[model samples]
Target: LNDDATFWRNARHHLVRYGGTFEPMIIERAKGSFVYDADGRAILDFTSGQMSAVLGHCHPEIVSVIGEYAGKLDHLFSEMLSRPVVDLATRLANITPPGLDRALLLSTGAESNEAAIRMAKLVTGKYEIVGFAQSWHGMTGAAASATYSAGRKGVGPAAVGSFAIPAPFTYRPRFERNGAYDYLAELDYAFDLIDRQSSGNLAAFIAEPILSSGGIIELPDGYMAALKRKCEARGMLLILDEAQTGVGRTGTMFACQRDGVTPDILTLSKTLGAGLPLAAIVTSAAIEERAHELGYLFYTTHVSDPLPAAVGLRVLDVVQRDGLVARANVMGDRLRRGLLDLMERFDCIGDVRGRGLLLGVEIVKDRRTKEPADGLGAKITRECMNLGLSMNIVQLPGMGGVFRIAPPLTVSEDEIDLGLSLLGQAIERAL
Candidate 1:
């Protein structure tokens, strides 16, 4: 029997509320895209366990590798070099775009972004960091300072010299020219403002190829290339944070590859560890050399720890070996079609966007007005949970809420259909 009352009491008495309310359930176990509660109810994991776990919950390969490494080699001192660490860096270098030759293996997405931002500041000899107004780049020192999505305020002033640009959002289409939504013009306008604000110390512009926390907002096709060019013009390094979009969740090896753009610094986390705590920041050999020469010191206890390195290695192997990259495309198309059908039937579903397994369904009061259905979105989420399907939603300014649906890459057709069915029914119930 489960002691639900004491559990909640103890949890409330001990644990600090991190961001929002925690899900009201006792998760006992997880295996392959589903998590079991204390009552053994199978909840279809659509958020992929905090939008990580691209391989799914308790994937056999991951479980096995984790066990092997936990028993074999755990953590190590900061100065020690291990085989798994070296191998992981090498594997990341080989898999990522050209010029990202070295990696600083750290833990957590925020830590990785912090490292990239620090390196950018050191190598560029600049203090300013720019990011999207709606971008979510971890909640650490420089990373949190750069991020504008949420978790701002309540603290003191952000690190000085942090700047932001408006993300090119096609759905809202704020910038108009000649009766057309000109996001490119918006990009130009945003950069001009940033230039005016810059005190001549713009170090780097960090961005997500797809702003997952900003409601699964994907950058326009040419946006990444244009942004890279902007960084080049201003002598700013482009730091791409692929914490959620990496590891084949976006139907590509990496989301930036879709735009044929290579960033100067690339941060990987979340999906990199497939639910474990592993993060990395890869950079060009030249930049890394510069940082090293500048006496870059981002030392910590678990820096380059062997256990997470080995786990990440296996995660990559399983993703590639299983052809999950291509699988994202096939499954994405199916899920998209289902959502589209739901849209046709319901007025609440305004738009469906995102790539591969990482998708978002925006709730709206009306299609033409595009007013966000705020309470409706929450109700649907609650209904889905009651029906044994867990969902995650992101609320932002000027929009109702976007149901961020990122199921594991290993999700089956049946699971996808089940999720779709449950989502449809939840919408009906919410209405």
Candidate 2:
């Protein structure tokens, strides 16, 4: 077996670096809430395998289903339909909000977002699309164009009619009235600018309920309803990209449910297939019919494959049967309390935001100025890893020093306590 140091040196030579340097450990295998290194070190997973593995790694049921389906039925022609495909679609419809009965299962988050954008343009007969400045929908075509968080540089021009508005970031508000953040005023101001830039052919507005890549910034209360109304008034469809916040990650089946505002189109990835690469775009019957009538085209090679569909079905089944939604609520409260306790002791801990299993801890130089402590955050993250805990820290330009903490939904109380303890110790050592 290859050792960690030898594997890292070889990986640097052979593998094309995609995002950043490797974590410096050869991850051998994962099970439940922990990953094992080549040395057999058990590292607690706090990011849930890029915030997707809600059921944890190598979940028994998911493994069984994958084996059973791979032996029975796996892939087929794109035009052909399978039982798992239809069954997964029906189950998604039943769980999602009313009127969102249609589904198009695909491979990844970007693919689903692209299909959704295509359908919206076709149905509305418009081309312009809007997204939040700090939003991260996907990395392909229309989705990449609509994404403003990162990866929008030196990539030539994006889709012609892509525009961005200011995200509702309460911690670092762009608009303020007295001492409080004026999110409503910020929204109005952002739209006023968007209206000026639009070509009167706005098709849709796509955004994440919580901007995960942009630093786990949760939209303020009632913002979704207000944004929906804005889309309605402009004759634009609202697309909610719940890739990270869907499937009981946010203490609900979907994050948009907390606002009582259903999007015209909903995209689910990441958690939908647990750790597998299954994604979906669900819309209303009316929108589906209109898109179909307009000859919408989004036929892909894996349009409705059986293997991933079966995985998705099993994911939903486990989530529902285990009552993970309510479990998220209970666990989230516990996690929040532990983080708050850490904040009380550490001045560098600026803000703790997000809901349920999805949470963020912002590191600042001081509470008053809120200056990002990027170096300190990086040190703490390294220390946590050295202490047998894996944590992900978002280090974008302005949003640096924000740690995204999303443990698996099945993580236990002892695991949470362990993570919190490690995090606190890491912070102290870094300071």
Candidate 3:
């Protein structure tokens, strides 16, 4: 067996038994927006390793800074407060919307969500928490409770008082609708679930500013403002989980910023660690104090160590100094426009929507019935792989027709053209 194949075989044989343990091919190295397989094949990594590697692989600046920090000082306790950790907290507070000053750093999005939920319950002195349907928070108990996916089914009944509200998907819905504005009806249906019974006990309502796992659905105009108003009137905390959409992925530093709204508590992960394992929960000083005094909460471990902070601090520096957030906005518009043109030409394209680089193209058998085209979506993705393009169709429950297309923020205009050209060819041939 070849070295790569042998290594993979051993990994599959002894290390793991899951069916999707590994792709057939083994990747050796990656740089910028491309990954090299063991067979010397170059593939354009379009989704940025599930949106974790926003700066792309082996970014020299980030690497140099990490190496420098490692050579000097690597690990420090949360109580110790290293320079990198303090600087990272300072930067996040400054860049984040005003009123979000306290920051709690952890190792992953699940941890961030856990912290958010725990904080919410503690501050409000309530037990019930609300999450949007077809949303993804993370994989832990509370985060999984917030997530609505088939994969999380066996995670058991989500925590008590965990309510699922139908998110606003303008393109399609459980009820037949023609115009985009009809999505507001779905929101009204969701609000109807709330009453004096749960209203007094509800602790928080959490949502992704722009839905990512729910087929890249962007909430209709004014929906966020109205929802925030309602939550305020009901005296419930609004939590924004920006794990997949933050840090220039959605054409902005924070997706909530796009709608001119800010949440009481914000959770961030993925790109925040600059490809490392780190996540954070940002809230107001009052909320932080309440969480500490009431919940007696504390999260710190080896993964939440200092090295990740060093990398995260450098990522923030590069994001601002290089103007990547603004660049994401410009590139996102260009990419979305190109996709819209393609949709106009293709009858199979059911919906083309999203903000910034985080975009989706829902496939359908026909424009009339809007029947899901999962077969076509899978075929096109496979063909794109053959053509050296790397992207994945979202594994959305029930909506098997949608494909996710989110490239790294570092992707150039020329690369975007190349990727989309491959997509067009795949669609033409597959359909």
Candidate 4:
């Protein structure tokens, strides 16, 4: 392990042969809001491994819980339900809507989203799934079909039965004159599309309450309610992909909770496992009634691994006990103010938007056109890296470029200030 050159050179061997073209980083370790690179640089982790570390890296409670579980009953197959599984499900149910009572465990957001799609199909007896433009559900077969990202290249030939409509994104300004579109207008547009088309074949319509992929674009006020009404009118199941914005990341246990709306099917991952691999698709009892009648059980062999559930349960406890949701709100406000100050200082910063810890800065060459400053976004990321900070630059197929920064909910005010300071420096350098 100490021989860096020997492993570093070999690490790319399998990736080059079988992996998609992605930047590979040799992460040594992570604690709190920072990760150590292979070269021993402690870089601030703003992306939080693509928004998975809700409580930050190697959370002590999670580690202790996992350790305790490992000593007792570490590996349990899904044939039997463990205490950890029950506890985790109970905690999640407490946080979720009253109607959403049944939980189907999995190991990734993609798996959960796939399960959501599967359940929708099973219940509605429809083949078509409707997603939204600029949304990221996940990367598995069904999830990939629903995801509207540039990374979905070569996926067209492999994907089927998934369609997408425009979402109410104010930043990108899709439905109306740059900033005129409201939630009701977007819902009306979506309903028009659904009405114009044959809707009996439509199974589900899925989207993040907020567009996590396209610069953390929040939907307009009342959009979710209108969309839910439309879905109910069309007799289509509504699935909310809370993968990136779930589990106290958005100043609440879930983003949709802010709107007091609940989906027929809800998918949760990321922060749920405390940085471990875990995911779930929770459904309403009414929907589960359909599944029970149809006898469609999605129990994979390793779906109920006790270790991740143990850690995840602890994560939930820590989140609630420590008041991380309220803390996130306080810190989120400070972060928003800081970013706004930076935007005012620099004209190159087009928009600073997000809810709670999940945020993004749309770098632009010209604020007038809001043209994606991909080159500038890359430059800023490089600068942040050079200054011992790690963030992400996303280039959507049609959306152009945006720099995303979603730190853990446990990230402190001082850490956010430090990260923003580094970002400001990077912005200046890019200019």
Count of steric clashes across candidates, in order: 0, 0, 0, 0
- Residue 199 of model 2: what lDDT? 82
lDDT of each: 0.92, 0.91, 0.80, 0.81
Ten contiguous residues with the weakest lDDT in model 1: 1-10
- Point out where model 2 deviates above 4 Å: 1-6
Model 4 regions lying over 4 Å from their true place = 1-3, 17-26, 155-159, 177-179, 397-400
TM-score order, best first, reads 1, 2, 3, 4
Candidate 3 per-residue lDDT over residues 72-188, each given as its tens digit: 878776567677777788888998988898888888888898888888888878868877788888767877787874346654565777788888776776644474356566666
**Model 2 lDDT tens row, 1-431:** 33557666777789986777677767889999999988789999999998999999999999999999999989999888999999999999999999898999998899989999999999888999999887887878888999988888998877899999888988887688888897987788889898998889999999999999899999999899889989999999999999999999999999999998999999998999788989999999999988888877787778899999999999999999999888898888999999999999999989999999999999999977799885999999999999999999987676548999999999999999999999999998999
lDDT of 4 by residue, 271-387 (tens): 787668889988887788888898877876568888777887888889899999887888888988999999999977888888887777888877778877757778888888888
Candidate 1 lDDT, tens digit per residue, 377-404?
Answer: 9999999999989999888889879999
Q: Model 1, stretches more than 4 Å misplaced?
A: 1-3
TM-score of each: 0.98, 0.98, 0.94, 0.93
- Among residues 3 or more apart in sequence or in different chains, the pairs in candidate 1 whose N, CA or C atoms overlap within 3 Å are none
Off by over 4 Å in 3: 1-5, 17-21, 174-182, 196-199, 397-400
Worst 10 residues of 2 by lDDT: 1-10
lDDT of candidate 2?
A: 0.91
